[PDB]
């Protein structure tokens, strides 16, 4: 249940996604052993997409966050879409 991604299999995605684009995931797993398409896509969206925001937290965010999490009880995709951040970070 590991499915853990080494820095080589992270470096091959970003080169595969650059080549094949984001809707050909079946081809990305051809370049990448150990990993299926649903595993490749899920990482590209949750981690490796450079348009993702992994950064420190301003003082307005923790106010914005604790506002949403209170006003929307557990819904962490809907909050994350409001925050423009990946859910498991938010």
């Amino acid at each position: 249940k590991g499915g853990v991604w080494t820095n080589v299999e992270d470096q091959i995605l970003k080169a595969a996604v650059q080549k094949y684009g984001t809707h050909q995931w079946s081809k990305v797993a051809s370049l990448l052993q150990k990993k299926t398409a649903r595993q490749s896509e899920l990482r590209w969206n949750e981690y490796l997409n450079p348009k993702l925001n992994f950064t420190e937290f301003s003082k307005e965010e923790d106010a914005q966050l604790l506002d949403l999490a209170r006003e929307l009880p557990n819904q962490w995709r809907t909050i994350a879409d409001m925050m423009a951040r990946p859910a498991q970070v938010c």
């Binding site: 299926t36 557990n74 962490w76 995709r77 859910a87 498991q88």
Partner: protein, 111 residues
């Protein structure tokens, strides 16, 4: 199917823009209805499954058999199927381990 999914997305965007249709008044009255009923019936809220619970293994057996009956028939298996059947067979080989895995997910995992 492409049309249907488009109507779903349109509907949900419009519920973001307009907002919920309940109004807080109706929601309050509904909540009152429930609470009064559950008092009238003196209901005991369902607990969280304890560490040692009498039936854990049995509730597994029922669950895992419900999952396995799908692949009892199937002939040529795709990859996802083999993945699942691997998970079920492991669930029989370590019941305790997979119970701990389950309960842990009942706590921590919100995405």
């Amino acid at each position: 199917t492409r049309l249907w999914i488009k109507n779903e997305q349109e509907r949900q965007r419009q519920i973001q823009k307009n907002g919920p249709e309940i109004t807080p008044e109706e929601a309050t009255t509904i909540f009152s209805v429930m609470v009064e009923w559950l008092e009238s019936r003196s209901f005991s809220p369902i607990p969280f499954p304890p560490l040692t619970y009498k039936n854990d293994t049995k509730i597994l057996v029922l669950a895992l058999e419900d999952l396995k009956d799908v692949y009892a028939s199937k002939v040529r298996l795709n990859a996802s199927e083999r993945e699942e059947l691997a998970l079920i067979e492991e669930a029989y080989d370590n019941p305790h381990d997979t119970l701990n895995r389950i309960k842990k997910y009942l706590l921590t995992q919100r995405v």
